[PDB]
Design a protein around this nucleic acid. Sequence first.
DNA 1: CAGTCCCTGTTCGGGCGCCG
DNA 2: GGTCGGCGCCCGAACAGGGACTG
Lengths: 411, 555
Amino acid sequence: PIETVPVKLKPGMDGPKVKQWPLTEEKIKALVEICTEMEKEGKISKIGPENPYNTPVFAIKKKDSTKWRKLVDFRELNKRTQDFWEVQLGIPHPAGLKKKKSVTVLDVGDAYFSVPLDEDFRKYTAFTIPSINNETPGIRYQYNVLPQGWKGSPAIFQSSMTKILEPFKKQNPDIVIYQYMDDLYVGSDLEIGQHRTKIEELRQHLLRWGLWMGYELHPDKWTVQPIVLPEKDSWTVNDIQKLVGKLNWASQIYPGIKVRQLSKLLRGTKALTEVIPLTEEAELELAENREILKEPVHGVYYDPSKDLIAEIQKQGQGQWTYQIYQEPFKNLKTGKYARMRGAHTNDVKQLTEAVQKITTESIVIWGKTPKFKLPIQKETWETWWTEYWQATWIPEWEFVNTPPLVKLWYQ
Amino acid sequence: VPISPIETVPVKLKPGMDGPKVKQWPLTEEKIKALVEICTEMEKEGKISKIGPENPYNTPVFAIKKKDSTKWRKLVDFRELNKRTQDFWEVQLGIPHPAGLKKKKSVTVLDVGDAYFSVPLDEDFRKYTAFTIPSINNETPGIRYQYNVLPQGWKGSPAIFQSSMTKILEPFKKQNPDIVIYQYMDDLYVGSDLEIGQHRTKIEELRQHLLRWGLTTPDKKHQKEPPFLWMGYELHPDKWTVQPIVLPEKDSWTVNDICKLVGKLNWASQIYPGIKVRQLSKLLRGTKALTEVIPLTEEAELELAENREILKEPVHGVYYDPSKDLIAEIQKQGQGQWTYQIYQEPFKNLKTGKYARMRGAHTNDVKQLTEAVQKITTESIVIWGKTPKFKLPIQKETWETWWTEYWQATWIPEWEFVNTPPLVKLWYQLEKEPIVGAETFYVDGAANRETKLGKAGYVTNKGRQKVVPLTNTTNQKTELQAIYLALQDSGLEVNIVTNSQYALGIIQAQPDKSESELVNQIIEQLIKKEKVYLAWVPAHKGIGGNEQVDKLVSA
DNA sequence: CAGTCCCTGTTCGGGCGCCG
DNA sequence: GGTCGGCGCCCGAACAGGGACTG
Ligand SMILES: CSCC[C@H](NP(=O)(O)CO[C@H](C)Cn1cnc2c(N)ncnc21)C(=O)O
Ligand SMILES: [Mn+2]
Ligand SMILES: [Mn+2]
């Protein structure tokens, strides 16, 4: 008996038409068991080939989670409904969420199934379930309620969510609550014990309205990865050549970097392994360049209207560096990960873990997901990345091939 | 017209476009008799109905002969209606493969006669499926019909039939969960582990369940005994093989005859191991006419004679036992060619295959092996829903050095080394630190965009120097040429300093094969060395000999 | 400075094979 | 015959995006 919110696509754009990719046996059995039960609860219903739209579907397990979780790759449908969840029913982003001592994430995607979806828009939520060895044709469905993983679901449910959180926000005014996609970010400066208790208070406060699990974050302990120069007692020709090239590349970010006196030490055609004593003019140019790399870059600030971009570099030995920016060389944040899952054995698992951690940080800090430039071949990535995905959202990405230049981001 | 028991599928035209209005083709008198004989029979069965002048639409119609039968098949040239019909989402996601079938105690195959003619068409859409049957006399106006079922030639019929067929089979398969029904269009592969007595009952139950909706299962197409003919294979209780493949023996080969040959060679490669189509596909490059005669090269005749000798011996595949692991073994066949076998027991191949795609201008064996593993992985997930364990002709230490030191992310699933030459390996290794006691070459190269002239050379720490003039070259070609010169004129150990990102990026990827003969010559020199240390410095910064050798190669 | 070109990679159109 | 849909392969042409040099 609930009224539906009318939703339309962006003018001059059709629905998504993305082919379903092959799925493993464990994922198909999980999807069948879930979609059969979702059909029994009216959340979805079967459709036919007259619906020309389709969106890929697969299954995941969150960290330390045994239950399979249906995940729809609504990235194309979200691009074609962008004016809805940004112009009309936008959700503000609290600037204090990143400053809290502890921030917990709660999957509240189950609440979207309580609200029906606009009849005219159900045609775009279509998805097909494949079969092993193509035993049967595709089993197509479409959503009758608010779908998980769609950026219009938290916007429509935003009015319902505010009235559920109003009693809890009143009792706990110092706690910040942010809703992004199927997740709920709850940040507080409380002690770990009473913080997790306040989470459980909110969990029971959400159960009485018809809705579990938590992921703890500590944004106050998030550190940046600066550009560092080696501290050597003896420098060789190769050492200074690598030093000048790194400072030359870093000069695109810090306009005050100079390599004049350091290049003067590389005048003759010298052997690389030859030790070169640093002149006093060069020692000061090096110490001054070190001072510049400690100071922040001039004129770097976030723009709410510009897209976020994330680049990742493979540094070997489980090391992974990343930079987030909107304009080139204006990095809003740099960082480094190490000893993630799959370290020293699986690059794709490490890279998948890296993208998730970076996207999680971008949601907490700016409320946006960045577009990734992935240091991997397209066929290598599209073969394995769903085997390691543990998040309910999926960021946009592209594939690059930049051979290592002057190891700018890692010593 | 009575109402069909099957729920119709609502179909619309694309907004702003009308139905087709095409004139009928001139038909042979032998095809006209076959059409009128079929049209009058389907009209009596309520599958087509007469239409008057109120239907302003028309589309061509013809007929082809059914394979191994005297019956005819009615086809409609709906090329104009398919352009203006709404888009559909195809539900046929792929083709089943016998290597994915599990052993069952009983197997039954049965085909549905005139499958499209038993599924109704949308009532509001039947007006656009209008056609004219020409009579034996050109002056006779002819009989005009319209389709009440799914026509053959309309782009929506296969998608509608497959979805309709799945809906009818749902109540039977729900009541019989332990019955496996492979549904490809109207071809039904039915297998079970029930006793053969109870199996024959369930088959008759299914033939009656399909009969309640207008689907007839003729006893002519009924198959009860092995070998079963299914999807172009021969299914035996313990093994399977493809139906006999016939290759043309043309004395004068055209371009189309090669395309027909290459296609059948790819089809045979799924079970026949060792099929190569490299040299035969080299005959299709840069050719325009499909009917142009082309002579067979010596490498193509040898490749063809080898494929014919493989097709002489009988090969067969086995079925899938989920209780035993899946194993895929790959071999380096020719340069750029790879073959693989997927099996569970030794020499009992589920299926075979080949990979031979050339990605990029510069590559190595490790890259191509990684690409082949991925192709097999996706192929295995389609057929068996899991990734096989790999046996690869590459040392564990070889692969460890590659993926750890490579700048891209790369990975191979659980695999073990099989010692079967030729073994994939890295042919040379670039040092991570400069070599003590090795001559240091500062290389550079430049060229002019207009004159297409340039220089390439080096300056070393021992006073050695060289500059070579180059004609019809580019800035990229000269910078590669300078490194090549430093490799020719150096000892077994060398330190090379360049400012060319393009040249450095290619070499650091450790290629062993390239489209450029210059890169291949660089590779051949790199393999002869013992220690090579490349290093990049920024240009125009006055660094070492890089500035001196830049001014030497300036013009 | 923007505007080329030299290079490289990706996507798509079209032929065959195979199945219904 | 020169209908349709699916999947696979092979090829070339068109598309496209970065890097160094130039008015
Ligand atoms: C000995 S030839 C096979 C006999 C076959 N059996 P069927 O009708 O039960 C099932 O076929 C349906 C119509 C699929 N379909 C098969 N071929 C074509 C074709 N050329 N164009 C369009 N759709 C085709 C038939 O009659 O087409
Ligand atoms: Mn049939
Ligand atoms: Mn140069």
